[PDB]
Design a protein around this nucleic acid. Structure first.
Ligand SMILES: [Mn+2]
Ligand SMILES: [Sr+2]
Ligand SMILES: [Sr+2]
Ligand SMILES: [Sr+2]
Ligand SMILES: [Sr+2]
Length: 174
DNA sequence: GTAATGAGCCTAACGCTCAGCAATTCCCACGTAAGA
DNA sequence: CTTACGTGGGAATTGCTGAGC
DNA sequence: GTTAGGCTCATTACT
């Protein structure tokens, strides 16, 4: 098990390729914090003030060739508890995602399902006769009243004053 | 003693790349009324 | 006849969203 | 994936 001195904290702490962070003045080795996001963190103190660090970055920074600005540390096996240096590697955020893609575990349908709902802006229609009705979306209205979306939108933005006799205005507050 | 520190624990944010769908932008086509 | 103006389509863009990193 | 800051309690220190 290889040990190296934590750069910028030499003489105070040390790190091992297995993911162990040892303190010299404290005598013992810092216990890993494992939050809800599941990444092991620890706090390193320097001159009274202590900062929070990610165990896997510390390992990667000290035992992994490939570090370049903006790069991100990846856990090859997806096991965030496996922090051996051999399981980590400096990768490009694009590449880290492409891997999820390959494994087919990147989820975007959940966002889409919630966007189809959340992108709707309630509008108010005004008939030539004066009667008004509030619809859930410009789309919904156009369909019910046989209108064209491009048009209805133009009126809503003030680019056109009316369309097919009706006029439109957004429903504010809600 | 009292007080500055260090180890543990947590919460809060924010960026990457994704790809379906509502909202938008706006170039076009037509019929009609106005211009030279 | 040659422009303008008033409509009404609809094709190509934007922007939003929550997940697993 | 990434960083910051907060809180508690013990450890040490010593105003
Ligand atoms: Mn990964
Ligand atoms: Sr909405
Ligand atoms: Sr919205
Ligand atoms: Sr365009
Ligand atoms: Sr004439």
């Amino acid at each position: 098990m290889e040990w190296k001195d934590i750069k910028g904290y030499e003489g105070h702490y040390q790190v091992s390729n297995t993911g162990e962070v040892y303190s010299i003045k404290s005598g013992k080795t810092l216990k890993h914090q494992i939050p809800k996001d599941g990444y092991h963190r620890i706090g390193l103190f320097k001159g009274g003030k202590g900062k929070t660090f990610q165990v896997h970055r510390l390992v990667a920074i000290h035992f992994c060739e490939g570090y370049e600005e903006g790069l991100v540390v990846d856990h090859k096996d997806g096991n965030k508890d496996n922090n051996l240096s051999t399981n980590l590697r400096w990768v490009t955020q694009k590449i880290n995602v492409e891997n999820q893609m390959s494994r087919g575990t990147l989820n975007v349908s959940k966002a889409q399902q919630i966007a189809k709902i959340k992108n709707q802006k309630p509008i108010i229609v005004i008939s030539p006769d004066g009667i008004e009705k509030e619809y859930p979306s410009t789309k919904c209205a156009c369909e019910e009243l046989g209108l064209t979306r491009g048009k209805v939108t133009d009126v809503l933005k003030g680019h056109r004053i009316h369309h097919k006799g009706y006029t439109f205005r957004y429903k504010l507050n809600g």
